[PDB]
Design a binder for these strands. Sequence first.
RNA 1: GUGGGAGAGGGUGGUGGAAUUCCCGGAGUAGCGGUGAAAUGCGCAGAUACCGGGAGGAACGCCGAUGGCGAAGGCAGCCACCUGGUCCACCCGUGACGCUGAGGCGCGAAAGCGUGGGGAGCAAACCGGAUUAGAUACCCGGGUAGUCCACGCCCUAAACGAUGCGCGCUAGGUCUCUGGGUCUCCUGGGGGCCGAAGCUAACGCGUUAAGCGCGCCGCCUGGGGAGUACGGCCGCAAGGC
Lengths: 116, 155, 70
Amino acid sequence: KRQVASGRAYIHASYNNTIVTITDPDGNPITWSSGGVIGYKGSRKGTPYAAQLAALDAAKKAMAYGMQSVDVIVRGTGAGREQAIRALQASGLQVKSIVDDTPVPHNGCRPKKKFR
Amino acid sequence: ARRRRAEVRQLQPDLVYGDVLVTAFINKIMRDGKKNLAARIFYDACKIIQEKTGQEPLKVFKQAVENVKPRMEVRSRRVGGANYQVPMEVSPRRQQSLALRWLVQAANQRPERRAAVRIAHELMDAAEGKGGAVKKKEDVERMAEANRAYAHYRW
Amino acid sequence: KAKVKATLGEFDLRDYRNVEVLKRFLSETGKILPRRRTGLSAKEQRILAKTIKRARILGLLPFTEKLVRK
RNA sequence: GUGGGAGAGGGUGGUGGAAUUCCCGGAGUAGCGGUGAAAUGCGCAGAUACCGGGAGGAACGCCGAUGGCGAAGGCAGCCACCUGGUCCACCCGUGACGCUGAGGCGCGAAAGCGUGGGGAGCAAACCGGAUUAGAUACCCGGGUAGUCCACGCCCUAAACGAUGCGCGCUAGGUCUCUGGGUCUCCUGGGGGCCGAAGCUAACGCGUUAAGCGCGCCGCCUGGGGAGUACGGCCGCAAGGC
Ligand SMILES: [Mg+2]
Ligand SMILES: [Mg+2]
Ligand SMILES: [Mg+2]
Ligand SMILES: [Mg+2]
Ligand SMILES: [Mg+2]
Ligand SMILES: [Mg+2]
Ligand SMILES: [Mg+2]
Ligand SMILES: [Mg+2]
Ligand SMILES: [Mg+2]
Ligand SMILES: [Mg+2]
Ligand SMILES: [Mg+2]
Ligand SMILES: [Mg+2]
Ligand SMILES: [Mg+2]
Ligand SMILES: [Mg+2]
Ligand SMILES: [Mg+2]
Ligand SMILES: [Mg+2]
Ligand SMILES: [Mg+2]
Ligand SMILES: [Mg+2]
Ligand SMILES: [Mg+2]
Ligand SMILES: [Mg+2]
Ligand SMILES: [Mg+2]
Ligand SMILES: [Mg+2]
Ligand SMILES: [Mg+2]
Ligand SMILES: [Mg+2]
Ligand SMILES: [Mg+2]
Ligand SMILES: [Mg+2]
Ligand SMILES: [Mg+2]
Ligand SMILES: [Mg+2]
Ligand SMILES: [Mg+2]
Ligand SMILES: [Mg+2]
Ligand SMILES: [Mg+2]
Ligand SMILES: [Mg+2]
Ligand SMILES: [Mg+2]
Ligand SMILES: [Mg+2]
Ligand SMILES: [Mg+2]
Ligand SMILES: [Mg+2]
Ligand SMILES: [Mg+2]
Ligand SMILES: [Mg+2]
Ligand SMILES: [Mg+2]
Ligand SMILES: [Mg+2]
Ligand SMILES: [Mg+2]
Ligand SMILES: [Mg+2]
Ligand SMILES: [Mg+2]
């Protein structure tokens, strides 16, 4: 209903899930998918397959609003962080660029014992 | 085989078709060391398939084996406690053993009375894309693409 | 690879204001390069660290950047 | 004394960006999260993921090091003021003014205590979910004291180099920080590694001694009882010597 046809794709990849958002050039989102959006429920969502199908689910949802050009942004290390990218390139969406923007603190906040 | 590759047994060419795949199939039929009986089963089944169908049994036997060859199967792998059903490909040697054994074990599950009737009927159905043997093949490749979520465990 | 001090001129290590030359000590990200990549001495790198941090606060050198790859 | 030098040494004020959390707005559906699997938890009052604006607290990525500084505890963004220690060159000045050091006094991580602040993240206790034969636990979701600041207490430690201090002497080689020099190197002052002589029960130490000597302080004399009992001093208490 928008006809954006150019914009950004954010891959949020953790060890428990891989989830993909697609926005317009200004950053405001359009559609999105994830490991849970497709049928997967538990630990399966943080798999490269779920990463693939999630990237492709949002990539077809963006075809509705007419997306062709896509700028990829990646945050987090995760299984299928790369597999969601590789899926995104073959989605028909012409991938403009790929950037890794994973936030790293300058040692500011005390992590949970899990990360200690 | 911890040490070596344990090379393949080379079968003798068929006495009739000069074809090694025939002999290998005859062997899977042979039980209790009766190769003589197993051939007379197979060859008297070659007459069934060639009369009840005006087509060369050679090309049907090949065509039946091909339709039962699985391109992928599922294997277990011990990972983090309980194991997982892991899909992976099938080496072309294993496609041979499975499809051949599947034809024979299917035919003996058939309703037909005499041995060669079951073989020729199963073979005829198997080339046509139906019959119990092609279901085992179509069910295996269903295990893969189901546990496809573990394609990263290839090993 | 080549080293930074090797392909350069005679410069003021203490001048926080010269961006054209201080940009040559940052990576693709804003990170300050190790001695193995700058070819500086123990005393020099210590001084460079402080001068780059000075330039960062004047808005001349970046704190962190975005890697365009992967 | 003079002239140079390096440094997370200390105190005070100021300040910068990254990240977490919360609030506001924009946009946007059906889950997010989390684990070996999970569940409690959160989500249609619209979360997670994304863009922007704001508040607040704590800690400083890269540089960063086997590195530097301090008597030890310990010290890490940047800027400025106050300030301590230390090292080198000149061979200028005083003329044994030295060394150690029972007492005394000052310092003393973390935790804990008092009064008043502060409170983002984490997190004893605790509230739940799991696991389990049981779970008073590791794993998961929540969360108070506290961690942070001011002022005043507490005085412990694997407070470690398990090695008290100062001085003289006794092969070298090699890496290194930092001075000076006639700048393949020489010569100081630190920090590492091999190893002469020698010591050591052995492992190992070996110009940074655990070697050869001298001065002075502390301390040891079988394990359990026991760092307990009593007494004393100290402390608001926990408790300490
Ligand atoms: Mg998960
Ligand atoms: Mg993280
Ligand atoms: Mg980490
Ligand atoms: Mg990690
Ligand atoms: Mg850690
Ligand atoms: Mg001075
Ligand atoms: Mg300082
Ligand atoms: Mg909102
Ligand atoms: Mg609910
Ligand atoms: Mg607040
Ligand atoms: Mg470091
Ligand atoms: Mg020192
Ligand atoms: Mg220490
Ligand atoms: Mg000074
Ligand atoms: Mg004189
Ligand atoms: Mg005189
Ligand atoms: Mg004393
Ligand atoms: Mg104390
Ligand atoms: Mg404390
Ligand atoms: Mg308090
Ligand atoms: Mg927490
Ligand atoms: Mg907890
Ligand atoms: Mg048990
Ligand atoms: Mg002892
Ligand atoms: Mg002791
Ligand atoms: Mg040496
Ligand atoms: Mg020099
Ligand atoms: Mg030395
Ligand atoms: Mg010897
Ligand atoms: Mg040694
Ligand atoms: Mg000497
Ligand atoms: Mg000595
Ligand atoms: Mg004693
Ligand atoms: Mg005993
Ligand atoms: Mg005794
Ligand atoms: Mg005992
Ligand atoms: Mg005792
Ligand atoms: Mg005690
Ligand atoms: Mg007594
Ligand atoms: Mg007492
Ligand atoms: Mg009293
Ligand atoms: Mg008590
Ligand atoms: Mg005690």
